[model samples]
Target: SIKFQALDTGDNALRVPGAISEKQLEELLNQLNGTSVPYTFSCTIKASDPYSSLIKPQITLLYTPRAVFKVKPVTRSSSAIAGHGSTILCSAFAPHTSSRMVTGAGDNTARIWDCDTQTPMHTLKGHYNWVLCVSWSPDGEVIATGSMDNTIRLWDPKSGQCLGDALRGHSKWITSLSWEPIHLVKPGSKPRLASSSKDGTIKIWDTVSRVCQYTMSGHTNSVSCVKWGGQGLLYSGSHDRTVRVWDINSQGRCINILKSHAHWVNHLSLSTDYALRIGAFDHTGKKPSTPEEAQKKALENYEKICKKNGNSEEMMVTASDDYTMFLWNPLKSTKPIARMTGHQKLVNHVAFSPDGRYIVSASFDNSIKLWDGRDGKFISTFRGHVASVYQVAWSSDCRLLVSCSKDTTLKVWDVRTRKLSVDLPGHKDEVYTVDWSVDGKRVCSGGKDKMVRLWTH
Candidate 1:
C-alpha cells in the first residue's frame, strides 16, 4: 500500500487555488520505492512575458531524476595514426598476438605498427609496385605480403623488417595472400604461404626457407582471394567464376570443385563452427510426420546419406559478385539452404563473427550489412563510406567492426550499439582492405594511395 499527501499553497495550510486528485497523488507515490529520496516541493505560476508579448513560461526541470538516469556520457580515447606514404592498400593484424600490425600500400612499402603506443615501429620498403595483400603468420612471428609488383615479401613481424629473400615468381600482379597453419610433423616446423595472382595461379611458398613450395595453376582468370581451410586444404576464388579447393599436402592439386556461382567469387570464409541446421523438405513441399520421417524421406536422400556418413550438420557460406549470397550444407545434396540478396552491387567480402552467430559483408554499393549466419536473414545495414567498400574484418571480441572502401578511408563501427565510432581519414587514394589485431586494440588499413597506415587507441 502507498500513501500520498499534497502540501497546501497557503503558508497557514488554510486553502489552495487548485487541488491534486487523490488518484493522481496515489499513482505518483506508487512510482517511488524504497530508498527513493524525496524533493522539496515548489510551484511556479503560469505567466506571459510582457517584453516579448507572445512568450509563455516554458518551465523545464533541469534536475529531473529520469534525465539523470537516461543520459549516457561520451568518453573519448587517445588514438594516434602512424606512417606517412602516398597511399595504403591493405592491412592485417598479426594472428594470436597484439604487439604488431602490417599494412601494404601504393608506396611500395609495408610497415608494422606498435599496438600500445600507436607508432610506426618498423618499415620494409622493397616492392617496386603497389602492395596489394598482407597477412600474419598464425604464430605471429612472420608476415607475408603480395604486391602488384609481381612478388611476395616475407617480413619479421616483431622488428618490421624483411626476412630472407624476396619471393619473385609470379608473372602478374599478386592480389591476395594467406599463411597455412603449422603442421605437427616436426618440432620446429614453419608455416606455408599462399598467394593468388592476376596470372591465374595460386603460389605456395615456404616462409622459413624462402622457396616456392607449390604452384596451383588452374583458374583461367585473375585469382582475387585465397584462404587456408581445415585439414591442410587451401581455397581460392577468382574472376573465373569458380571456387577451387586444393590439398596443399598433395602438391597443390585441385580436389573439390564448387562451380555453382554465376559471377566471380570475390571473397569466401569458413565458419568458426561448421554445424548447420537444415530444414528437411519433401519434393511436394510438405512436412513429414516426425524428425525421423523427415530424415528418412528427403527426396534427394540427403539426410539419410548425411546421417550415414556423419556429415548431417555442416554449413558453408559463400558470397559472389552476382549480388547474392548462399548458405549451403555441403553434404545435403540439395539447393542452398538459404540465400541472401540485398546488396545492389557485387558482394566483395564476407566473414563470420568469432562466435559464428552473425555474418558481416562488404559490397561495391558502399555499404556493410549484418546477417544471421544460420538462416541468412538480413539484420541491419551500415552506410557511411562514399565509395565501394572492398573489405571488412571483425574484432576478436566482436565488439568492433572495421571496413575499408574505395573512398580511401577506414571506418570503425560499434556492433552492439550500431553506431559509427570513428572515421579514419588519412589515405590519399582508394583504401582497399582493413583488418584488426587479435587483441582488438589496433587497426591497419591499405589503399591505392600506395601507403600503409596503422591506428591504435
Candidate 2:
C-alpha cells in the first residue's frame, strides 16, 4: 500500500495498493469523492538493484503548448520601390527600426532606403563589382557590405558615406559577413566584424581600428558562411565539408572541427541568433542612455532567452548540400546531438524562431520543412512553391514565416495550424531574398525583378 497526500488541501494521507496503473488509481480516487475530478500524480523512487535491467532509473516528460502571441500576416503590397540597376542579391532591416533598410545589388552598390517615404535615401557606391552580402551592425549605426571586388566596406546610414577605406586583405571575393554580438563588446568600443571569403580564409576586423585583428585559415576549400556567436565563439561553414569552431578570445584558434557532411556546408544558425541580432533594441524601440546601460540591457536580454530555452551554452545547427542537417552543442563536445534528415535536395537556408521553439528550412526540392528546435525531429512540411525555394524569415512572434522562391512568388505559412496563410505574387522574375521586420510591421523582398517590394498587413 502507498500513501498519498493532497498538496493544496490539508487532508490526511490516503493509502492505496502500490501495484496499480495510473488509470486504476484515478478510478479509486474518483470513487472516494462525490464529484469526479481529473488529477495528475507523480512519484520519485530509486531502484534497489544497481544493475537490474528490468527497472528503469529515470523518467522524462514534455509539455507542448500552443504559441500565444500572434500578428496579422502580410497580404497586401504597399509599395514596389524600384531603383536597383541590377538584380538585388541580399537585404536586411535595421535593428533599431523597420523604417530604415539596406540592400545589395548586382549594380555594384548598396542603397539605404527610407521605408516611411518609400524611396531611396542614399545609394552607397564604391564596390567595383557585384555586391554579394549586406549586414547591419546590432546598434543599427553602421552597415557593412561585401562584394566581388574582394573587399568589405563599412557605411554610415545617416549620411550614406563609406567609413574609412575598404577593408582589404582577402585575395578573392567575399561570400558572407557577420558582426560581433552587442553584449560581448566592452564599453566605448566598436563591435568587430567577421568576413568569410572564397579564398578559403576568415578574417576578423575591428571596425574602428580598421585593421584585421586576426585571420583563420584551416579549411581546404572556400568558406561559405560565418557567424559570431553570443558567447565569444565563432562558427564557419566551408566548402571543404567541415564546420570549424573557433575561440575569438584566444586569437581565432581552431578548437574543434566537425566532419560529418559528405558535401559542402552551406549555412549555420544559433539558438541565440535572434536575441543577438536585436542587441539592446527591443520591440518597444526604447534607447538606452549610456554605453554601460546598453550593454547591461543586451546581456539581460540574452540571458533571459537562454534561460527560457533551458540551455546555458549556445546550440548550433548546420545545413549542408548532403541533404541533411546536424544539431551540435559546440562548447560541450565536437559531436552532434542529432542528425536531421528528410529533404530530397540541398538545404539552402535554415533559421530558428525568435523563442527557439522551431527551426524552418528551405530547399531546392520546392518545399519547406519545420522541426522541433530541442531535438531536431521532423514536425511538418510546407509544399506550395513550384520551383526551388531560396530563403525564409520568421515573424517576431513565432506564429508565421515568409519564404521567397524562384517561382516568382512569396508565401506566408501559419506555424500553428500548419497551413498556408497568404500568397504574395508581385515580382516579375525570380525572387532571391526576403526579410521580415523585427517589429512585425512590414515584410520586404527583392529579386531578379530589380525592385524592393514592401508589404503590410
Candidate 3:
C-alpha cells in the first residue's frame, strides 16, 4: 500500500480540486510513483462532444536554425615578382611534394616557383598563346599545362625544364588539365592525363610518352573542365549545358550524359560514389521559381528517401553561370539534393574540402563563400576582393583558403577565423586561379598577365 500526500492543485498548475477524491488521488500518485499495477487508458474526444472540447490535437512543428559564420580579412606579407609581358591566367602546385609551384599566364609562359622561398624558380617559355590551365603530377616531380596555343606541355618542376615532350593535338585552346593518380590505373603502366579544349573535345594523354591516348568528343560547345574520379572514371562539363561521365578503361568515350541543366554547364564534379554533381543557373531568371523550384524539392525528397532506405549514392558537385551551385546524386537523374545560391553573379568555381564536409566557391560578383557541404548552408563569406573572384582552393590542412581575382592579386584567408592571412600582388592582369601544394607550405597563382607566381609562408 502506498500513502499519498495532499495535492497542491494550485491555480497555475494542473488543478483537480474536489473532482478527484483522496482515495483516487492516492491511487493516482501510487501509479505515478510506480507503486501501483500498470494499466493502459484510452479516451476518445471529439470537438462535438462536451468532454472533447477540452482536448486539443497533438501537433508539433520543430524548427532548426542554420549555422552562422563570420569572416574577416587579414593583412599579411605581400610578395610581388614582375617579369611577364602578358596577363597571368592560371596556377597550380605540385601534389605530394612541397618544393614546386607552377603557373600559366597570358604571356604564353609557364613559370615554376620554389617552395621554400617566395621566388621565381624557372619559366617554361614555349606556348605560342595564352596558357589557361596548369596541373602537377601526383608525385610532384612533373607539371602539365594547357594553353591557347592548342597544346599541353609537361615540365620538370625541380629544374624548371620541359619533361618527356609537349602534346600537340587539340585544334583549339585547351582550357583544363588534370593528371590521373598512378594507383588508379592498370598495374605496371604510366599514369594518364585528361584535358578539355575549346574544340569541344576531351583528350587523354600518356604521361610517360607525352602522346594522346584517346579522344572523347561529345560536347557541342567548348569543354570547360575535366576531372578524373576515384573509381577510374572521367567527368567533363561544357558550355553545351551538359555534364558527361566516361569510363577511362573504355577508350575515353562518355558512359553517361547528364542533361539536367537548361543553360551552359560551367563545371562538374564526381563524388566518391560516382554520383555526378553539376552547377548551372538561369542567367535570365526567366523561370527561376517554377521548374527549378519544383525540381529542387523533388531532389530533396529523393535524397531523404535514399538516406532512409540506404539505397542511393552521391558522386559530384558543380558550379555554374546560373549563380547557383548544385550537389547532384547521379543515380536519380532528377534534381539536386541541395542548391547553394548567394553569388550576385555567375559562380566561377566550386571545390570540395579534403574531408568533403565543406565547400568553397568563387564568384564573378567579387565574393567567395564557404558552405556546409552536407546541407548547402552558407557558412561564411570572404569579401575583400574588389573584382570578380575566379578560382578558390583549400590548403592541404584545410585551415587556409586561397583565391584569385580580376583585381590582379591572390589572397589567402584563415578559414576558421575568416580573416585574410596573406596577399600576393604581382600579376599585371586578372589572376584566374590559385592552388596549394600538398604540404600547405606554398601557394601558386596564374593570371592574365601570362605569368605563374609562387608564395611561401
Better of 2 and 3 by lDDT: 2
lDDT of 1: 0.64
Model 2 spans with C-alpha error above 4 angstroms: 1-69, 308-311
**Each prediction's Cα RMSD?**
14.8, 11.5, 16.9
The candidate, 1 or 3, that scores higher on TM-score is 3
- State the weakest 10-residue window (summed lDDT) of model 2: 45-54
Residue-wise lDDT of candidate 2 within 19-113, one digit each (tens)?
A: 55655655665666643555554343111111123255422111111233346688888658989999999999998898988999999999999
- Locate the minimum summed-lDDT window of 10 residues in model 3: 274-283
* Alpha-carbon lDDT of model 2: 0.85
How does model 3 score by TM-score?
A: 0.69
| Candidate 1, 1-457: lDDT as tens digits | 1122233222211223234443443234435543323333222211211112223332211112221211111122334364747666666665545556677767788887776676778888888888777776644557777878898888877666678678988899988776664321133465577788888889888776767888888988888777765346676788888878798768888877778889877776655421111123311224446534543342233333223345444345777867888876543443567888899988878888754667888888899999886677898898889999988877655556888888867787767546676777776678777766554555666665555555666
TM-score of 1: 0.68
lDDT of each: 0.64, 0.85, 0.64
